[PDB]
Structures are given as C-alpha cells and as structure tokens.
Nucleic acid binder design. Sequence first.
RNA 1: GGAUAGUGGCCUACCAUGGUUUCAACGGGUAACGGGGAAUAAGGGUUCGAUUCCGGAGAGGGAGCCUGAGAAACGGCUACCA
RNA 2: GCGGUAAUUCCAGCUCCAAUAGCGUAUAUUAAAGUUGUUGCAGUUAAAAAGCUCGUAGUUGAACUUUGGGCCCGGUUGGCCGGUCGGAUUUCCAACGGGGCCUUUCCUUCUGGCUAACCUUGAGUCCUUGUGGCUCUUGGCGAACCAGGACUUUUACUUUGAAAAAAUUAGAGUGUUCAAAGCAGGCGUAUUGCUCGAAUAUAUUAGCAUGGAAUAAUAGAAUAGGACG
RNA 3: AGGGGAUCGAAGAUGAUCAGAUACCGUCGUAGUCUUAACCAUAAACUAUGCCGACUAGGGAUCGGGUGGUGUUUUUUUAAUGACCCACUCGGCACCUUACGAGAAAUCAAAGUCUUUGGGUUCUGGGGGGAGUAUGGUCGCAAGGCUGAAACUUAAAGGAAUUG
Lengths: 129, 144, 155, 150, 81, 87
Amino acid sequence: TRSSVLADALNAINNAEKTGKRQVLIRPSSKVIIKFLQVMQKHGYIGEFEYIDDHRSGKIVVQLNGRLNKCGVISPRFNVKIGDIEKWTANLLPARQFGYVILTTSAGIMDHEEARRKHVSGKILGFVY
Amino acid sequence: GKGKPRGLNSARKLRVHRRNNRWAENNYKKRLLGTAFKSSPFGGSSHAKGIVLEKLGIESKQPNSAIRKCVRVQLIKNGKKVTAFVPNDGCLNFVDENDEVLLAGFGRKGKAKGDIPGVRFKVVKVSGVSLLALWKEKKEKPRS
Amino acid sequence: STELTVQSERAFQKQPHIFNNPKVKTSKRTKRWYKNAGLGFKTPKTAIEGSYIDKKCPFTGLVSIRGKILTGTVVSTKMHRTIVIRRAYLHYIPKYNRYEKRHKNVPVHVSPAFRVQVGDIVTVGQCRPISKTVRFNVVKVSAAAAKANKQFAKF
Amino acid sequence: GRMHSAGKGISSSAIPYSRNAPAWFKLSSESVIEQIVKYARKGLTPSQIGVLLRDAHGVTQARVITGNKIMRILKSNGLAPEIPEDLYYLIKKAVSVRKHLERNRKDKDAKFRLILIESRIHRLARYYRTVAVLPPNWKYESATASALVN
Amino acid sequence: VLVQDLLHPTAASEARKHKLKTLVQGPRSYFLDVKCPGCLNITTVFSHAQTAVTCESCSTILCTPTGGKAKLSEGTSFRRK
Amino acid sequence: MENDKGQLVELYVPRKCSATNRIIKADDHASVQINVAKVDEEGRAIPGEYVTYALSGYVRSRGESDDSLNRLAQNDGLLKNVWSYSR
RNA sequence: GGAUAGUGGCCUACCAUGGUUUCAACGGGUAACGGGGAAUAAGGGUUCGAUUCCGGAGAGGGAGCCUGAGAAACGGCUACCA
RNA sequence: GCGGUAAUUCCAGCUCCAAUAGCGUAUAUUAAAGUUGUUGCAGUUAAAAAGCUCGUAGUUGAACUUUGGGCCCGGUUGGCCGGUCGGAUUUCCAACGGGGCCUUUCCUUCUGGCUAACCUUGAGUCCUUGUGGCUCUUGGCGAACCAGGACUUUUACUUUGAAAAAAUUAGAGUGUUCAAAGCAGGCGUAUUGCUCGAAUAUAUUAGCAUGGAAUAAUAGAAUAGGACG
RNA sequence: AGGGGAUCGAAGAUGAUCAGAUACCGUCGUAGUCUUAACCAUAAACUAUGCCGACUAGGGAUCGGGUGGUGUUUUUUUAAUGACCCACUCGGCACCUUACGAGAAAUCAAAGUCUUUGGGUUCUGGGGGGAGUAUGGUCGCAAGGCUGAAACUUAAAGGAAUUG
Ligand SMILES: [Mg+2]
Ligand SMILES: [Mg+2]
Ligand SMILES: [Mg+2]
Ligand SMILES: [Mg+2]
Ligand SMILES: [Mg+2]
Ligand SMILES: [Mg+2]
Ligand SMILES: [Mg+2]
Ligand SMILES: [Mg+2]
Ligand SMILES: [Mg+2]
Ligand SMILES: [Mg+2]
Ligand SMILES: [Mg+2]
Ligand SMILES: [Mg+2]
Ligand SMILES: [Mg+2]
Ligand SMILES: [Mg+2]
Ligand SMILES: [Mg+2]
Ligand SMILES: [Mg+2]
Ligand SMILES: [Mg+2]
Ligand SMILES: [Mg+2]
Ligand SMILES: [Mg+2]
Ligand SMILES: [Mg+2]
Ligand SMILES: [Mg+2]
Ligand SMILES: [Mg+2]
Ligand SMILES: [Mg+2]
Ligand SMILES: [Mg+2]
Ligand SMILES: [Mg+2]
Ligand SMILES: [Mg+2]
Ligand SMILES: [Mg+2]
Ligand SMILES: [Mg+2]
Ligand SMILES: [Mg+2]
Ligand SMILES: [Mg+2]
Ligand SMILES: [Mg+2]
Ligand SMILES: [Mg+2]
Ligand SMILES: [Mg+2]
Ligand SMILES: [Mg+2]
Ligand SMILES: [Mg+2]
Ligand SMILES: [Mg+2]
Ligand SMILES: [Mg+2]
Ligand SMILES: [Mg+2]
Ligand SMILES: [Mg+2]
Ligand SMILES: [Zn+2]
C-alpha cells in the first residue's frame, strides 16, 4: 500500500526526464507534493504544472524542460540540527555551488539555502539538482 | 527497499540485528567468547616461556622436502605442551633438553607458518640470551 | 481508594492537631484541615468535602509536592490508595539516527480525593519517599473515564 | 490489494463527479428517506436498500438526494442492527462453513477457509471495538456465533 | 509520445479507456425511463439492474439481471436520462 | 562558466537537443543536426541559409526522431498540420 | 508502632494481594570499578580507559564495635577463619 | 614461492636500497573494510528467501481543515556616490531577512494596576512652494507585564538560551635560542616603576527556559450526557 | 491399529553376465503400493528469484468477465437464442522483439528506475573445510524434525564465460 505519496511523485518526474518526456501525470498529489513541486519550479527545474480536481486526492500534470538530473526523496524524514544541514548537502549534492536539499521546517517547506538565510531547520524532505 | 527497516523508529530492530550478525565476524566472536584466554597455549599474551622436552625433526610439507628442526616445549604457566620451530641454520645446536626457552607466535594470527605442519610458534631465546645473538656470535650460552 | 468505613482501622484515624472540642456544640462534627498544594493545582472539592483521612494526600495530608511534575497514563489500580503509571518516550540512538519506544512504570500515591481508572492520563508531583517505591502523588486527573457511558445498550 | 488471496482485481464503482443534481431527478429528500425506512422496515440491509433504490427508483446515490448515508438514516430512525452489516455477513458465513466442517471433518480446504473468515472477523471486530460501535471486549466465539446471526 | 497533452485528451481515446483510467473518473452506466403500453406511466430503470425490476402496478417483469447491462423485457421501449 | 572576475573559462559550450534540451556530447556519434532550407518566392531554396534543428542520439535510438522533428518544424511554420498535440 | 540524624518494609504487628516482564523482566557471563578521557584522521564509525583530575570501594577474608562532629576506621580495638 | 650442480630467494664476500639514534620481531586493536553496510553490502546460478498460508508483539500506513490579497515598522550585508580629516551617515537603488496590522480570524479569562504606542490635537512651526520634523497636555489602543481570582486536550520535531571543573582537544596571543612545552611576558628614568595578558570554540542524550506551528501523531459533537447566555 | 491386498514391487532367494558382480538385465516375490482412524513434517517442497505499492517499451496469440456492431453463420416468416468475426477494456497462464536500463557474465519487463546510492516491511548470508558434526533444550512410538557450537585445519574452495 502507498507509503509515501511524495515518493511516487518524484520517481514519476524522474522517469519522465530519463525517458525524454516533457510532461507527467502524477497521482495522487498533496499539499506536500505541491510545495515540493513549487520549490523545484521557483528554481527552474520544472516548467508549469496543473492540479486537476478529481473529487478525491488530486492529480497533477507537470511540464518539465530537461534541466533536471535528479529529484529524490529522503525516506525517513530525519531531523536535521541546522548544523547537520552541511552534512546532508555534501552527502547528496553534486557540488557546493548549485543544487538544493529541500526540507520541512516550522517556517515552511523550504530549500536549505532559504533555510540557512531564515535561520531555521527541521526535518529533511528530499533534494533537487 | 530490500530488507532492512527504514522507519524512523526502527532503531532497536536495527541494533539487535547488527548484534546478531556480528557473530559471523571471526575476529569479533573470538574476542567475546574469550578464545584467547580459554584455548590457545599462551594466555592470550605475546610470548610464553617453557621448557624443552625433546628435539623434533618435523618433515616439511609438499611441494617441499626438508627436515624442519623444532622443539617440544612445556609452557611454564601452563604445563600446556607445544612444538616450536628453531629459526636459522644450526641453532638446534644451541638448544638442549630441559633448557628454558622463550616462545613467540609466527605472525599469522594463530595458524601454521609455511611448509611446517602443526607448528604455530618459534623460539626467540634460550637460557636467557636469544638465538639471534648466539647465531651472529655476539654472545654465549650461560654456564648451567 | 479508601471508600466507606473511614474508621476501619485498629487505630482511630484523625488529622493531627486538628482538635474538636466536645464542649463546644459544633454543626459539622469534625473540623477538617486542608491546603493549596501550589503550582496552581486546584485542591479538588472532594478533599474539602471529604471525611477520609490519608496522611499522604497532597491536599489534606502531611506531604508536599516539590521537584519533578510528570504526566503518565494509568496502567494499574489494584493497590489500595496507590497506582502505577506508564511513561512512554522515544529513545534516540545516534548511530542509526532513529529512535526506539521505551517505557518506565512509576508507582504513585493516589488520594481518595481522586477516582482514577486504568486508561486515564494523570499528572503527578514528586514528594518525599512515601513508601519503598513511591516518590510521586497524583495531583490532577487530565482525563475522566475515556468515554465509558458511550458504549451502552441498543436502541 | 486483496487481503486474503493473491487477487489483484482493481474493480469498483466509478462514482460521478456531480455531487448534487441529477436535475432529471425530481422527487425529494422527504420522499426517498421515507422510501429508505419502509424498506429497512421489511428487514433490508442498507446495501440491499441502496441497490433496491438504484434500480426500481431513480436513486443515483442516496447520499446525494438525501443529505445522509443509508446506514445513518436507519440509525436515526431507530432501525440499526445489533452489529454492523459486514460483520454480520462474515459471522453468518463462518457459521455456514463451520456447520459444514462439522459434517465433513475430512475437508481440509474448508478448515483453511474457516480460519481466513474468522481472521477477517476478528480483525474487523477489533476495528469496530476501537471506535465504540461495539462494546469493549465484544468478541466472536464460535460456540456462540450461531445464536448471534440466526 | 515524448510530448503530448495529458490535460486535453481526445474524446475518442478517452472513450475507449477504462472508467477508472479516464482523466477524472465517472461511470459509464446510464438510467432510462421504461414503459409497456398496457400501463400509462414510466418507471425508471438502471442499465445494470441486478434486481429484476417489477413494474409499478402490474407484476409483469421489465428487465432480468446479467453480467452487466440488464436485459429489458422483449416487448418494450425506453429513453436515456 | 565564468570565473573570479568576469573572464570566460572552460572551453567549449556543448550543443543541445532541440527536442530534450540535454547536452549532445562528443562521443554521441549517433546524434544529428538537420539543416532545413529557407526558401524564397516561387519555390527556389536560398542556398546557405537554414532553419536548423539538433537531435540527441538518445532520442533517435528511441525512435522518436520523426515525431519530435514534426512538432519542432511545425511550430516554426515548416509544417502545416501533420502533428497533433493531442492523443 | 518501633527504630533512625531523619524519609522509607528500614524493622515489627495487623490487614490486603500485590510488584516486574518480548519496549527482554528474571537468570548467566564479564580476563567490568564508573566518569573526564585515549587510539584510529573524508564522513558515519570501530576499539580502549587498572593508571596524574572528579566519584565509588577496599585494606588477607568475613562480622562486630569503642572513641568521636565525622569511622562500621584496620599504620583502632574485639571474635572467628586463613 | 625458492633449494634435486651454471640458486636473481639459502650460507657468505662485494656492491646496492629503505628508515636512521634508532631499526626488527611477537601479540592486540584501528585504518585499508561498502568483508557488519544508519550513511552503505549481498541473497536466480558465487555463502544466503522459511514448503505454504493465517497471525500477535514490532516496524509501517492515501488525500482533505487559513490559504490568498492589502497596508505599515524597524533591522544587515552590497552597490553607486563621500560629507570627510583608512571609515563616517542621509537620501537614489536593488537583495536578504525580523516584527506588527486589516482582511468573517482568542490574544485563556475576567477584576485594576502601567500605560508604549496614535484614530488623537492643543497651540503652531526649525525650515527646501510641505505631512519632510519632535518637543508638547484636557475627550479617544491594550495586552508590554505586573498580581489576585477563575480554567487550561496531550506529544514528537526544530530554534535560541540558561546551568554548566579543571587538565585533554580545537584554537588566539607570547620568539621557551628552535621545538615538544610553559603561561608567560613586554616597556622605561634598568636609583626606589610603567604596563598587555592569563582569550575563544566544542561541551550533543536527558532535565530546565524561549521562539517556530511545516511534517507526524493525540484528543473533540452522533442514543447529543454537545456548545455558548 | 483395522480392512484391502488385482498391479507393480525396497528386503530376501534365484538365472545369467563379470576377474569379481553383494549390481545393471531376467525370475520368484516379503513389506509396500489402495482405504479408515491416528502419527510423521520432510523433497532440486524449484521460478534454485519474499510480500505490498509506484513508475519505466513494443508485438501478436490465448483463458475469464464486461461494452460497442444497419459483422458472419444457424431458418421459420423475420426475430430471440447460440456458436463464430472485428474493435476496445479490466484481471489471468504464457510466448515474441527489443533495451532506454541492469549484471561477473549467462541473461533479465525485472534481476530496471543504485556511488546522481532512501516508498513500506519480513527473512537469510559474511572464505573453505571441521559440520548440520558435538552439547543442552524441545517435539516424535520410532525413524527422526526444530534449535545448534567450538578446538583444529586450510590458500583457496566457488561462479559465469573463453579458447583448447
Ligand atoms: Mg552460521
Ligand atoms: Mg611429540
Ligand atoms: Mg492491595
Ligand atoms: Mg491494485
Ligand atoms: Mg496479509
Ligand atoms: Mg467487483
Ligand atoms: Mg507501612
Ligand atoms: Mg500473592
Ligand atoms: Mg533480547
Ligand atoms: Mg574486576
Ligand atoms: Mg569500560
Ligand atoms: Mg578509570
Ligand atoms: Mg584489573
Ligand atoms: Mg574505608
Ligand atoms: Mg596482600
Ligand atoms: Mg560468606
Ligand atoms: Mg575494619
Ligand atoms: Mg589509613
Ligand atoms: Mg657456482
Ligand atoms: Mg650464487
Ligand atoms: Mg645475498
Ligand atoms: Mg616504521
Ligand atoms: Mg543516514
Ligand atoms: Mg560481501
Ligand atoms: Mg547457492
Ligand atoms: Mg520460495
Ligand atoms: Mg498522512
Ligand atoms: Mg544547545
Ligand atoms: Mg577552557
Ligand atoms: Mg501386495
Ligand atoms: Mg538382491
Ligand atoms: Mg550369483
Ligand atoms: Mg544383498
Ligand atoms: Mg529444507
Ligand atoms: Mg524446477
Ligand atoms: Mg507488455
Ligand atoms: Mg457481444
Ligand atoms: Mg601452495
Ligand atoms: Mg566449452
Ligand atoms: Zn407495466
């Protein structure tokens, strides 16, 4: 049974890109998926996306460009202690100058750079590059 | 995920499971079972001193043909009996029955050396002096 | 616990030094002392209204609450006038960077000013060693019955 | 997918987007609630009623023409059974399977099947029991099940 | 393939698909008003009846149940809505 | 890939698949670049002057070379119908 | 209630039947004093700490106790064992 | 792996190599070891999926409930000017953050004590044609927190901070002749004395105190024994 | 422990074969093979491939179910039926072709979406022997099942593929 609804949304996006597609249907969407989708978008890693309203949990159509190598999820949402943020980005980003660890914090779902700027931390959602 | 838990609360399962599986580590299990202290002719200690019971001529393994000079030694703190090799040319002439000798391991973590069957130790001293010195003739075997 | 009898001992039960002079014709028979335990724990009316003795009652007795103020949930009410609570907590194990459920049972005194039942969340205040195991006293019930009456008969 | 067998059958009602209307549907909440009742008065399960209302009448979904689910309507009018319908039909079935296993102590398949039905029963009782629709420590015993259902 | 409109699928290729695999789901069963000229009124049947729907007044029949779509009783007529 | 002070560094900025905007690297010797001729009034095809498209080896291997070119050239004006953005 | 410097099954009397446990009780092992710490350097870790500082315990083994503010003291006494 | 007669390997001579006041050997442990795998292993055939299904403990568990829009306030980098005798502040500017309002929006709640802040304004105005600007009391802001009452669903996570031994560790300062160290020392009238120090960081699980309200739990009103008065 | 006991047939006895032949082949044939009531709990019990969920690629057959047709065939008077044909769609047992992708390879629509390493969960392995042995526990009438060590020994054992 569906354990992470986010996990499906990322792996879907990932398989689209890999296969050269320019869009994906995803199912079933969530507040969290949207916000994660939103961060990637803000940073260019996908185009526009549309929420279609089945009278249920939602579907999403993402339009993706091809700037995307990987968008991954972090399966237990481990707590990060703001100083540990460095250790995550390093572990799992390609270089120190681009790419993002995106994570959930009391002050919103935000990438680590915004997290750094706002001086907050929390739990780790996933990543983009 | 194949096969380990990934959950945020599966820490206990993950420790236990490790503990359980460490017992497949040959070094780990000997450490905790206390094999050293229990079996093993030395205490678990680096050398041991014993007494020379008889001089053996151990025939070497294939593909090698030789007589490997050795000694049966009874460990002083132990009475455990052990056969040990007497390194270098001659040197068997430097020992004698009832002589005191200082045995050490063969650097092989237990386990026999090369073509010598059974032997896991080598002689380092006799009557308080050391082969090496006697061999290179910079010292002499003591009176009695 | 207590319930009934109140004078059910070999020794006459009384609050110490709370004299009621027989010569003086009073209309309540027994003069009763109580206190406000502090930290804003309301001394419940069952204590002031009460007639039970209990010298380990935080409100009518000779103990005091000072130190830790813990909450836990009731797991045994077999002991006369004392209970056991389970205190859950997740214990962090660094190497795996996750947690494991742990618990501790804790024995606490419970004043007959309270009617506790298995399932209730209860707030307890540390007091002086009250027995071999008990260092705690039920100070408020942050519960009730956990919906008991709402499983009754059929329509 | 499918809790007690290898089956992967995706298969259900595809309910309509339109949560109100049917616009060609006249009548009234008044009418079909009355309808819901007299049916359940004959001794009909809510499911049966939903079906019965779906075919002979126009009742697309009872919950749309009426504000409520069919079982809730029943409960309100004081018509709800001692235990929920689905638990009932599990117990009723386990009874019929057991009654057969008693007559056929050589039918290992039936033994196996009984276990499954009861394992589903006990898990469902555990649910209802959690949400107060069954008294705490309500329990299915086989020695007493035959009474429960007939 | 490689680039297409998931948001505006063609009605045909949407029509051939399974009811739960359309873009948003809906049924593909209909209702109908059904009459046998012996009587003067119109009962409303569901295209997949299961219950052998008996007419308003006359115990006649109307449709037997099947695997899916109910089979309507031989000498009759109907409209969809 | 600029540097410390504005200077362009790291030789060579690779082409991209007109279709997937992924890099077309050197050993990608299955990729393609189609030069399509600009033409003037009454036929005639204006030599040395093209509408041009590139196409990754990936895409052509996956057999998507023909559909993808269709869409590309058509939303430039060199095709008139043929390609449906719906299915 | 007694005893204690004093809380407390600490002990006694009466009364009750409780208390802990797969979230591992209870039992066994430890060539186990605990800690500050040591060694090994991508990180995560692994292994070690009798031993300069803090805490605890002991004075051949057990128990008892005198003096005294403070000891169940051993460069104090008493007894038994060795 | 060499040695059974021309031994690149033994016993030596010669010469050469490596580290050098030091170098070898034994035992243990650490790194290599992603061969214990949380990060991060492997299990068709190399070692390894229980014959099969049910199932308790345990781990895990779909989506949805204040979002959007408007207004003010004051911060810290950075630009372009520098006014000024290296750094300075206003306005032009973007950028990144904090707070507080109004949007249908408890902020625990009364009962006063307090008021710092403007819907105020009472006069007018230093002065750039004036909302640029602050002193200034007589109708009109709560919450900023005192303290007395009366009552509060329960957690995880994260933040900042308090409480915190030294030595060790990281690390600043200082020319123990260098250095390991040490916490000294450095200037003069070196005849009656002047003076810089003896930092900082880490210190985590738990407990304490504060801010956040995403993620994940908990509780709520359905035989109404519901909510406010 | 009863019944049954045609057949085939561990054991046994034979005829041949052979240097020998306790066998292969032939003959006789006990248990057994079948059934009831109870035991036993193991098989290369095999796909040598845990389960649930998602995604990633093409093709023609087939099993079940359903939908669509001024399709075919059955004649009667056209139908209704039925069997058949075409298109589609769920869910099966499989095959074909490819490989973006995986692997040490053989190969693999999973053995893919893994150093760009995290959906959930169960289980097992950690060089080869010693050995599924010893010992204790437990189950069994028994045979035996489950659980299951070490000392010591050893430089390979092993897998896939290539050429001979
Ligand atoms: Mg093993
Ligand atoms: Mg011998
Ligand atoms: Mg009791
Ligand atoms: Mg399914
Ligand atoms: Mg299951
Ligand atoms: Mg169905
Ligand atoms: Mg007592
Ligand atoms: Mg008892
Ligand atoms: Mg255990
Ligand atoms: Mg010790
Ligand atoms: Mg230790
Ligand atoms: Mg120590
Ligand atoms: Mg010691
Ligand atoms: Mg002492
Ligand atoms: Mg001594
Ligand atoms: Mg004794
Ligand atoms: Mg003493
Ligand atoms: Mg002394
Ligand atoms: Mg020679
Ligand atoms: Mg030579
Ligand atoms: Mg030489
Ligand atoms: Mg060295
Ligand atoms: Mg990790
Ligand atoms: Mg391995
Ligand atoms: Mg194998
Ligand atoms: Mg299997
Ligand atoms: Mg959820
Ligand atoms: Mg802190
Ligand atoms: Mg310090
Ligand atoms: Mg027979
Ligand atoms: Mg025979
Ligand atoms: Mg014969
Ligand atoms: Mg024989
Ligand atoms: Mg087996
Ligand atoms: Mg097979
Ligand atoms: Mg296919
Ligand atoms: Mg048909
Ligand atoms: Mg060899
Ligand atoms: Mg071959
Ligand atoms: Zn009719």
